[PDB]
Every structure is written in C-alpha cells, then in structure tokens.
Short mmCIF file of C-alpha atoms in Angstrom, two decimals:
data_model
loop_
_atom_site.label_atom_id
_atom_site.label_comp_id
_atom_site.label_asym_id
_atom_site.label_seq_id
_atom_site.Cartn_x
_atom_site.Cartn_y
_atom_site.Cartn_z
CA UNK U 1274 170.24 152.28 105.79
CA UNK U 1275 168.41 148.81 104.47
CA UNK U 1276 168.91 145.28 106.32
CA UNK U 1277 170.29 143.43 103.24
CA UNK U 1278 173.02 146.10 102.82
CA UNK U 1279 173.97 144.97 106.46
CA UNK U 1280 173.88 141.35 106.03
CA UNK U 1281 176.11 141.92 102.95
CA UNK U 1282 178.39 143.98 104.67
CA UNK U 1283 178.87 141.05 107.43
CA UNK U 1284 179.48 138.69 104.57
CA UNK U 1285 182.43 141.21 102.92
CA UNK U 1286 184.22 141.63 106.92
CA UNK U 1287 183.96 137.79 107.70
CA UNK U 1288 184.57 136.48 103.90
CA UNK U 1289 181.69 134.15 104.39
CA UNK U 1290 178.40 133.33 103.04
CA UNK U 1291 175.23 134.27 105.30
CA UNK U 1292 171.78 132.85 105.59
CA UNK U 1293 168.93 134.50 107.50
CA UNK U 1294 165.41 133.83 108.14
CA UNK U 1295 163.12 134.80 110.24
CA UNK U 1296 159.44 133.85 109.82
CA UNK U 1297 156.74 136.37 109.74
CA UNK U 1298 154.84 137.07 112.83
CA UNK U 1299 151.18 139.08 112.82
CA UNK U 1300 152.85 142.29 113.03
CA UNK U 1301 156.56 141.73 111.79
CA UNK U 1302 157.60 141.00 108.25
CA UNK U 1303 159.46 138.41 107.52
CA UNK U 1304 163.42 138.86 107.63
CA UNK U 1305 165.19 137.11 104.25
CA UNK U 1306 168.68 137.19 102.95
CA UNK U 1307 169.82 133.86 101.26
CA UNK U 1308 166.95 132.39 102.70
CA UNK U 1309 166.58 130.06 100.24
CA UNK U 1310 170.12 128.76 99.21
CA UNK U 1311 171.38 125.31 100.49
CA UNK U 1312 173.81 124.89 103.72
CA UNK U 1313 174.62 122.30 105.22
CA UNK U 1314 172.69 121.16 108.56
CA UNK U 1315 175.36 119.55 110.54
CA UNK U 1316 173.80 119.70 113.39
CA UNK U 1317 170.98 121.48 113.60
CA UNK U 1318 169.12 118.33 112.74
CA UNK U 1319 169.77 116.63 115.76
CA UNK U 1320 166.71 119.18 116.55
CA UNK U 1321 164.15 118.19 114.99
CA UNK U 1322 165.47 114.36 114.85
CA UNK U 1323 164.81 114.57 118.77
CA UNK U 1324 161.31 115.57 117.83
CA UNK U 1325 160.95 113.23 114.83
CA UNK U 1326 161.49 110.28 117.60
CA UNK U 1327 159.56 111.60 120.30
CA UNK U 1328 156.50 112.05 117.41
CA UNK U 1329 157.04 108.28 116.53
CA UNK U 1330 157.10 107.07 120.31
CA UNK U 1331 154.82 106.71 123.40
CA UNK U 1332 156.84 108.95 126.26
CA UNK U 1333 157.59 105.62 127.86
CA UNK U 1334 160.03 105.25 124.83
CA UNK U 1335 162.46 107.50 126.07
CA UNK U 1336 163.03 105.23 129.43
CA UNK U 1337 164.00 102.72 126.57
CA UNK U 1338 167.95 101.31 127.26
CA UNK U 1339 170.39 101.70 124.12
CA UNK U 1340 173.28 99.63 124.33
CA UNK U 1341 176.46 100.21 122.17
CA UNK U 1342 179.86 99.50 121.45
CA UNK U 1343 182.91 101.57 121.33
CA UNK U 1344 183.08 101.41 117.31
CA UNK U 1345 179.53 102.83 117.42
CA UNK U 1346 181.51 106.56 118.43
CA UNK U 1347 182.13 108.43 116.19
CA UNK U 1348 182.52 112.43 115.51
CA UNK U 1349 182.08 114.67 118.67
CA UNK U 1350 180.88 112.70 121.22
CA UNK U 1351 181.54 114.57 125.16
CA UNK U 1352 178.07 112.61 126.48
CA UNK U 1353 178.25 109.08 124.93
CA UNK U 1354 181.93 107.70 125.87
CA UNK U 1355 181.08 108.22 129.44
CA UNK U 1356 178.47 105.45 128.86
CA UNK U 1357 179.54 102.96 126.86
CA UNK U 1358 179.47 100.18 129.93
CA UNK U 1359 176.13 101.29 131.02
CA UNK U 1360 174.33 102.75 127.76
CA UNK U 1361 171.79 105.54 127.39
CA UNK U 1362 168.19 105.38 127.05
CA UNK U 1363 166.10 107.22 124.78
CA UNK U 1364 165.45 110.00 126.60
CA UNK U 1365 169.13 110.32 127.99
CA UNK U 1366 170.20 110.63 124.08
CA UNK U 1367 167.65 113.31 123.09
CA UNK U 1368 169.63 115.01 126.41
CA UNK U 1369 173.00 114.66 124.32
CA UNK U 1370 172.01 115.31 121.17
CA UNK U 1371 170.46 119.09 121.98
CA UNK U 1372 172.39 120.53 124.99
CA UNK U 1373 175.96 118.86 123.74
CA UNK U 1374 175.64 118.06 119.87
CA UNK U 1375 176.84 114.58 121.11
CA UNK U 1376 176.96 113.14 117.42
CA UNK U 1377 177.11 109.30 118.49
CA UNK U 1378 173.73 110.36 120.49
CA UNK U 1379 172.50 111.82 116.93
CA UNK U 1380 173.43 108.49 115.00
CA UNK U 1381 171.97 106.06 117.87
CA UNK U 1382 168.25 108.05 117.49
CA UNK U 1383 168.69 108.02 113.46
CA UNK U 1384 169.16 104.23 114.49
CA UNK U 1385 166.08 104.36 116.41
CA UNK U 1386 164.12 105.96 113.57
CA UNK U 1387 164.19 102.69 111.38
CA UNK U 1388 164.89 102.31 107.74
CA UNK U 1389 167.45 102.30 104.64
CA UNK U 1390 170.62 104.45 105.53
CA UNK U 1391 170.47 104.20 109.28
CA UNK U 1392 167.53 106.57 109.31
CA UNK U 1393 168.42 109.39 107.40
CA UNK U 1394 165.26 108.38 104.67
CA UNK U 1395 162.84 108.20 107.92
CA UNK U 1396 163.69 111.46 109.29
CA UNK U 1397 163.52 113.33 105.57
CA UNK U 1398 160.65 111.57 105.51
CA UNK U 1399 159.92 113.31 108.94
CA UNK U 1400 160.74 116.53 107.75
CA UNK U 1401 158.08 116.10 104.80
CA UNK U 1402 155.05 115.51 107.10
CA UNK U 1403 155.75 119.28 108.45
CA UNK U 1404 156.17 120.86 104.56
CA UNK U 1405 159.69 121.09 104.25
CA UNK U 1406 160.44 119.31 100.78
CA UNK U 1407 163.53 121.02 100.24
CA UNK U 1408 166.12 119.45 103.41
CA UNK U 1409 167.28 116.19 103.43
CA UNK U 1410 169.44 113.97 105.69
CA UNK U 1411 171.59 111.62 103.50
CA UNK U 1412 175.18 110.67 105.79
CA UNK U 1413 174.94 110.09 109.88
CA UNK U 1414 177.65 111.67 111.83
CA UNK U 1415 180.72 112.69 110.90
CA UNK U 1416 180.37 112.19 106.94
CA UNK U 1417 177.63 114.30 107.01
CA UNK U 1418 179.73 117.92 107.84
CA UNK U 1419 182.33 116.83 105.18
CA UNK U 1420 179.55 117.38 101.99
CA UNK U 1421 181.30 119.90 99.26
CA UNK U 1422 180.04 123.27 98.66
CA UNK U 1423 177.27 122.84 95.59
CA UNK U 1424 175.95 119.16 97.06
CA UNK U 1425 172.82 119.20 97.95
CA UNK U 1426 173.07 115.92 100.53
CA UNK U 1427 172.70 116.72 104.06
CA UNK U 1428 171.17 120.37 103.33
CA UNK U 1429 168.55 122.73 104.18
CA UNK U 1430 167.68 126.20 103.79
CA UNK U 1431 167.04 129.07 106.44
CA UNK U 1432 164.17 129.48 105.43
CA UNK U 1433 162.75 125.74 105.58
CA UNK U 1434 164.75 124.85 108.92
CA UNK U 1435 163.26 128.22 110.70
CA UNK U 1436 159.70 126.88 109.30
CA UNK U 1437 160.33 123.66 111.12
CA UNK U 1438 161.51 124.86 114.21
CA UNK U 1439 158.63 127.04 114.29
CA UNK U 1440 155.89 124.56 113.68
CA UNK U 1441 157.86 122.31 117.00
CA UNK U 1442 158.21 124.86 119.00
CA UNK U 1443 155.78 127.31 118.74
CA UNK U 1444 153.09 125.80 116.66
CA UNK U 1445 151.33 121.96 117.20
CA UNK U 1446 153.35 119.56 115.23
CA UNK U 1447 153.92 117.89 119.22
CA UNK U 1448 151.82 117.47 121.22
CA UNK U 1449 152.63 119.93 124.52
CA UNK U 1450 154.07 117.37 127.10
CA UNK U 1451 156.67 116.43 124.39
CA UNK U 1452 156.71 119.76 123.04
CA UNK U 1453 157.98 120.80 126.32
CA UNK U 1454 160.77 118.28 126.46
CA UNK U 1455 161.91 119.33 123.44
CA UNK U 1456 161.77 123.13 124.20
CA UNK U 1457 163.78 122.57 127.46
CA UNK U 1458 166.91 120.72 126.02
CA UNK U 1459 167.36 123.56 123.74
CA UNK U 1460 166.32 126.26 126.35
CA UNK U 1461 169.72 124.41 128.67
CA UNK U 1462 172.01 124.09 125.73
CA UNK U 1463 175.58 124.12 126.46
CA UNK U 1464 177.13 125.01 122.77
CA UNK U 1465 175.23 127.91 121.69
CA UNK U 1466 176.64 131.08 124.10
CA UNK U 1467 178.77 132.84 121.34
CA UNK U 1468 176.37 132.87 118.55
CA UNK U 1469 172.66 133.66 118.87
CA UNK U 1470 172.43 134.13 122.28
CA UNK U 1471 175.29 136.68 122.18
CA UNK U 1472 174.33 138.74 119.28
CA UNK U 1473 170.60 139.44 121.17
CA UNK U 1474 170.28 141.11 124.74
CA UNK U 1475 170.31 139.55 127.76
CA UNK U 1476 166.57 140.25 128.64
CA UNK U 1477 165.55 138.20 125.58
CA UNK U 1478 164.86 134.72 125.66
CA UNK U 1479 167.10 132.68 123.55
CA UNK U 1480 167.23 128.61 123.08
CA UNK U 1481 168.88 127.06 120.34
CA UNK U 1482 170.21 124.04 118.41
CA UNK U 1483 173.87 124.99 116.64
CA UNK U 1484 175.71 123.74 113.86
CA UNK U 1485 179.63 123.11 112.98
CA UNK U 1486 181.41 122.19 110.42
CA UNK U 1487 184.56 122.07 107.88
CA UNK U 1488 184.24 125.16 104.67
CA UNK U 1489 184.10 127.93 107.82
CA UNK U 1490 180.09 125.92 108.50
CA UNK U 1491 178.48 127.85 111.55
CA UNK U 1492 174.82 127.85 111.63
CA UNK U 1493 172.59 128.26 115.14
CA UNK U 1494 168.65 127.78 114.89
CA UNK U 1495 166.81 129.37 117.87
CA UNK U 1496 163.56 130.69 119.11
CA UNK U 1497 163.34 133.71 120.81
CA UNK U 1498 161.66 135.90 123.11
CA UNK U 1499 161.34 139.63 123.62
CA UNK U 1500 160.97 141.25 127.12
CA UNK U 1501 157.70 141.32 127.14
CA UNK U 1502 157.29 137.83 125.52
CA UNK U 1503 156.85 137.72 122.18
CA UNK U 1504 158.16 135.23 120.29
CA UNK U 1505 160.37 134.78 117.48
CA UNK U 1506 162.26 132.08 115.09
CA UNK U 1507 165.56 132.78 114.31
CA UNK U 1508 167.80 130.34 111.45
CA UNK U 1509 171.49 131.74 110.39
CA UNK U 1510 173.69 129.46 109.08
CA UNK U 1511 177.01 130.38 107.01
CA UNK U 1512 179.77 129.06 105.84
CA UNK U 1513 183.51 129.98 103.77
CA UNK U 1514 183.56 128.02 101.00
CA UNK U 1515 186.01 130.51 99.54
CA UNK U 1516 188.80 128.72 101.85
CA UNK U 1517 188.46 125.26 101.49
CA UNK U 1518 187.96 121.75 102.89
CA UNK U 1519 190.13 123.48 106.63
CA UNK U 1520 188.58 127.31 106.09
CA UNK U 1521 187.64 128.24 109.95
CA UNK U 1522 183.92 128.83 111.04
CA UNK U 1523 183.82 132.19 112.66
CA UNK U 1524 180.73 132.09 115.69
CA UNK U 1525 181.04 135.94 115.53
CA UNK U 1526 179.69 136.81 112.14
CA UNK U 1527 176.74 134.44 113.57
CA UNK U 1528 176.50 136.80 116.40
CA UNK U 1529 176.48 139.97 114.41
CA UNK U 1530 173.79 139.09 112.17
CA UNK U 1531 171.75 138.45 115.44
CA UNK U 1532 172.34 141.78 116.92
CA UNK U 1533 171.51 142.88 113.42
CA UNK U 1534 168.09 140.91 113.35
CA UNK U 1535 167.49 141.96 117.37
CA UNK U 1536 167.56 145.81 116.25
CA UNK U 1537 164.80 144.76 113.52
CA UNK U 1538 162.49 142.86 116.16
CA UNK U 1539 163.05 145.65 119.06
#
C-alpha cells in the first residue's frame, strides 16, 4: 500500500508539490513526505506572530489601541477597513489575524514586534527561541506571497512549522492563560473549512491557521484531536510551481492528504 506512494499519487492528480508533517506522538510515528523542503508561509505565520506578541507582552497589552491610516491596508484585509476611524487594539488584531488572515492585522503586530524590517527580524528571531533555525520572515504583507519558487525569504518547512505549532499549542512555550487565547482564535477560524478540517471526520477536533498564495500556494497548519482526545499536529503546505507566477492553489489536494493522514492516526 505505503503512505508516501499516496502522497505522491496526490501530487501526480493535482500537479502540485506536497508537504506533510506530522510530529511523533508516544505511540505514533512520525508522518514525513517533503518535510523538510522550503514553502512559503504566507500566512501561517500570522500564527505564531500572534503568539510571538502575546510572549513579549503583559495581557493588558492586548487592550492596547492601534491607530492607522488607510495607506497602512494592504493585501487581504475583511477585519481592518471596517476600523480605520476607530482602530483596533492588540488583542482585536490577534482576532483578525487568526480567524480572518486579515493581512493589515498581520503587518500592524509585526509593527508591534519592534525592529529592522517592520518586524520580520524580531519574529525570526521569535521563531529561534522555540528551535526552528530553518523559517524566516523577510517581506510583511502582500510582498511576502509573491517570493519565487527556489527563494528561501519568507519560508519554512513542514516539518519546523508543525514543531512550532506544537510547542504553542500543546507544549509550554505560553504560558496557559495566553496559551488559551491563542488556541481559541484558531479553534473559531473562519478560512480553514475546505482544507484540514474537511479532509478529517467530523468527530475530530480540528483548529487551524491557513495559508494562500500565487504558484498554486495552499498550506493549512492545525492541531487535532481524535474522538477520544488525543492530540495531534498536522502542517501541509503545497504549491504549483510548474504553472507560474497565476498557477491556481487547489484547497482539495490539501484536503486529501488529510483524509490520507486521518486513516494513519485512526
């Protein structure tokens, strides 16, 4: 039968590239195919940028008031033009940037971070204190989705983003009452229904951070949870370099490789 012979067969049906990890548990091995190639974030970072600020930041920092300006929005943006009289705080922006990708939202808490290239140093620097030394933010939102295929900028790797999202989520890199904060915005995500969540049953817990871009990008990073519990962390990302600059993500191959992963875990 053999999982890799699977993934590859997803890859051949879709034309795209596919990258899978999913971190060993004490009874499962872990799950690896292109696990260690670069794609690029888009935005799954705004996931572990929301924790990167909350880390930095008393709670009380989130009732903090961000003003900006209309040139300030930029890429996808559904929370943050409704607000540009009033502004967001903090905590209103770590709202945006999980449950609707809102990419101004992303750049305002990069902002927030501090530092040389409107915080994209900080939070690689962020990403460092958990082990990952192989991602790296270099481009805030929208220039970093447009990277060509062989760049390394504004890349990670399944297996270093899972690794991450494992240590926030599941392990102690926050402490719990931000931990939790974090772990609800991605539990009410709004953007994630046709990829990760679809490919595993409905009786499975699923939140999740997702990912578009141009080159057919699609990635979704989520933890899991069988029936009875047990947890999981799930990265795919993929993309169709083979097309070009305007080659179409396809959410579906995403899916697949879920339902693909679920039969492994069940």
């Amino acid at each position: 039968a053999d999982l890799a012979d699977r993934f590859a067969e997803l890859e051949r049906r879709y034309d795209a590239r596919l990258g899978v990890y999913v971190p060993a548990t004490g009874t499962t091995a872990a799950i690896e195919y292109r696990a260690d190639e670069r794609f690029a974030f888009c935005s799954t970072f705004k996931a572990p940028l929301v924790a990167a600020v909350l880390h930095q930041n008393p709670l009380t920092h989130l009732d903090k008031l961000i003003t900006y300006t209309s040139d300030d929005i930029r890429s996808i943006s559904p929370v943050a033009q409704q607000h540009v009289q009033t502004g967001m705080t903090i905590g209103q922006l770590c709202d945006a940037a999980i449950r609707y990708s809102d990419g101004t939202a992303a750049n305002l808490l990069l902002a927030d971070l501090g530092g040389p290239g409107g915080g994209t140093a900080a939070f690689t620097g962020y990403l460092r204190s958990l082990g990952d030394t192989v991602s790296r933010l270099d481009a805030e939102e929208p220039e970093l989705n447009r990277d060509p295929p062989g760049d390394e900028r504004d890349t990670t790797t399944p297996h270093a983003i899972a690794l991450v999202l494992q240590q926030l989520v599941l392990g102690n890199a926050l402490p719990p009452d931000k931990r939790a904060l974090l772990t609800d915005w991605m539990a009410r995500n709004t953007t994630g229904a046709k990829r990760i969540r679809a490919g595993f049953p409905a009786d499975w817990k699923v939140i999740d951070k997702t990912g578009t871009g141009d080159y057919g990008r699609a990635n979704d990073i989520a933890v899991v949870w069988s029936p009875t519990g047990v947890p999981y962390v799930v990265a795919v990302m993929s993309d169709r370099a083979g097309g070009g600059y305007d080659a179409e993500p396809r959410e579906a191959l995403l899916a697949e490789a879920a339902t693909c992963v679920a039969g492994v875990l069940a």
